[PDB]
Amino acid sequence: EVTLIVFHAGSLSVPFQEVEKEFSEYAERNLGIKVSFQDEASGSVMAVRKVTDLGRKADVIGVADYTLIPQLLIPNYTDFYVLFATNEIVIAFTDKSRYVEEMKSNPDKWYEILAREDVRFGFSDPNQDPCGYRSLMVIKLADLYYGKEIFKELIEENTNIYSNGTQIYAPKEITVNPGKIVIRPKETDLLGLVESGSIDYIFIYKSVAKQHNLSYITLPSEINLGDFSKEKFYGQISITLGSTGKTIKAKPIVYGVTVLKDAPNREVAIEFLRYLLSENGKRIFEKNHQDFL
């Protein structure tokens, strides 16, 4: 009997749950072992810091931005990573969202709608979650793409987050105007808020919006981080986190996964990884609206 310890990005919750469920069956039939899981979801930065700062043991680490593995875990905790999936940022909402009809009919004016006094939006804490820092990157890239001071109007005037040129800085302790913004530790924490209508719009991954049946509008490929051909435009922007003190450049979204060198159940963890990368894993992710790399 083995229990694999898995720390992973909040956006990986739905597909990972299914991959784990299928792997347990696979392991019993082909490995003669009973595999259980101690699965913990959190923003990817937090997932990594559980190991690097809290001294916790783990077998598998799955992150929404592969960058975090070589940046924070190599070579001290592991010596490899596997790039395996992608995504894009969208703006999600529901029938209870203010100006929902206008957002759907004029998606190219999303930033004007979010700037209206009565509209509230949300994103996750950039210090703990890639979706959060990517949301800020998207808004800053909007400045460049549209030629307007959108970041100033939506973020700087409503929070203590700021930007020096193309460099965004997330203070370790972020404060926000509750009349306009709600922030949470990870993006999936925002789902209940937008579904209840308490917040009108949230910046979140397309895969997660679809997994939860949320309506959404797509953003320009120049700013949504899901188009690999737009790497140079994305690269104009970067962010520095107060949690790690390190900088991450805006780039196409690529998920990464690794198994710790000292994983308590190394061999079974590697088997889990190969199952995830197999046609079975691919099938599961596609069924759940997320494409493999």
UniProtKB/Swiss-Prot annotation:
Organism listed in the record: Pyrococcus furiosus (strain ATCC 43587 / DSM 3638 / JCM 8422 / Vc1)
Record GO biological process: molybdate ion transport
Name of this chain's protein: Molybdate/tungstate-binding protein WtpA
Positions annotated to bind tungstate: G10, S11, S44, D129, P130, C131, E187, Y205
Main localization category: membrane
Assigned keywords, A-Z: Cell membrane, Membrane, Metal-binding, Molybdenum, Signal, Transport, Tungsten
Quaternary structure and partners: Monomer. The complex is composed of two ATP-binding proteins (WtpC), two transmembrane proteins (WtpB) and a solute-binding protein (WtpA).
Protein family (similarity comment): Belongs to the bacterial solute-binding protein 1 family. WtpA subfamily.
Binding site for molybdate: G10, S11, S44, D129, P130, C131, E187, Y205
Subcellular location: Cell membrane
Function per UniProt: Part of the ABC transporter complex WtpABC involved in molybdate/tungstate import. Binds tungstate and molybdate, with a preference for tungstate.
A GO molecular function held by the record: molybdate ion binding
Coiled coil: none
Entry GO terms, CC: plasma membrane
Membrane topology type: Peripheral membrane protein
